[PDB]
Ligand SMILES: O=[Se](=O)([O-])[O-]
């Protein structure tokens with residue numbers, strides 16, 4: 001039952017009950033309480049405990065939380081050499097889950113390696 005914490009400005013990923021995703025800096029916020037369920041080695045599912053919705057990635061780089069379980073609910077997780085974690089799309093091979101430093105998620109299509117934006121540290 002972890003929260004994820006962005007390197008890019010220190011925001012936790014927030015999942016809204018309506019599907020909308022973003023960041024906030026309030027650890028006490030309930031919509032930041034996640035469930036990361038590993039499904040194979042290195043492949044996880046991050047779900048919103050409260051929202052009861054799964055993080056999904058859309059064809060256009062779009063990030064949102066859906067009820068439905070599909071192959072877009074999936075992310076190869078990864079411990080970076082710097083000890084931050086990364087979730088890149090199992091479907092959209094090149095796409096990473098990311099938060100802009102202002103707090104809005106960043107288009108998957110505009111991510112890539114080397115970005116702070118992509119850098120997460122999960123916590124209980
Ligand atoms: O982190 Se950001 O907003 O893409 O510069």
Ligand SMILES: O=[Se](=O)([O-])[O-]
Nearest residue numbers: 008101115116117
């Ligand atoms: O300004 Se920064 O460190 O490249 O995100």
